[PDB]
Design a protein around this ligand. Structure first.
Ligand code: NA
Ligand code: NA
Length: 208
């Protein structure tokens, strides 16, 4: 499907255009596409966030096309913040767009913090081949109900994350019924400053 690679472009979202960028892998391209959601739009989170980039690099290394996008209101994406509700619809729109362009592909959903919540919400509604959360903000009220996730779920978490505390994520992983692959980076903060190479390696190791 003719879609320019490694450049920002716009697609139709629920409330306006969504800014998207895709990548295509450098070797065998698997019939799996990963969509990666960014951290909190109200705290400067965008599709260009470095943890988002790292997730994309990991998925690319694994042979997946990747799709990153800005939630409504962010960057060139039109509209305004919608309480985590419309943001779910934004991801759902990007997901439909992926399914339209690559109908044969399985889907991976991934996200960092706010984006981990949004992607988990969608993966709870539509079983996908793999869900990936980095620093899922499990204190969000909307996380409480995500107890029987059908999609396989990898959670990567720094144990020195002060924004999303390890013990809270651990407790969430413990309380939910469905199995989670819970991978912890020792000494990593919420932002993985200087640990992005290791984060990529950790993702690849656990997703290969
Ligand atoms: Na966030
Ligand atoms: Na905007």
């Amino acid at each position: 499907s003719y879609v320019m690679t490694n450049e920002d472009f716009l697609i139709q979202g629920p409330v306006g255009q969504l800014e998207v960028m895709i990548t295509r892998p450098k070797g065998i391209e698997k019939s799996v596409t990963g969509i990666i959601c960014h951290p909190h739009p109200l705290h400067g989170g965008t599709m260009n966030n470095k943890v988002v980039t790292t997730l994309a690099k990991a998925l690319d290394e694994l042979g997946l096309k990747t799709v990153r996008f800005n939630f409504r209101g962010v960057g060139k994406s039109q509209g305004r913040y919608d309480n985590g509700v419309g943001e779910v619809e934004d991801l759902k729109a990007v997901l439909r767009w992926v399914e339209h362009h690559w109908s044969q592909d399985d889907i991976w959903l991934a996200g960092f913090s706010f984006g981990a919540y949004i992607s988990a919400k969608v993966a709870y509604d539509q079983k996908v081949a793999q869900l990936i959360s980095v620093a899922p903000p499990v204190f969000y009220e909307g996380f409480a109900s995500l107890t029987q996730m059908a999609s396989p779920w990898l959670i990567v978490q720094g144990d020195q994350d002060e924004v999303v505390p390890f013990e809270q994520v651990k407790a969430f992983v413990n309380q939910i019924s469905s199995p989670v692959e819970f991978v912890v980076m020792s000494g990593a903060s919420h932002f993985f400053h200087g640990r992005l190479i290791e984060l990529r390696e950790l993702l690849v190791r656990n997703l290969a």
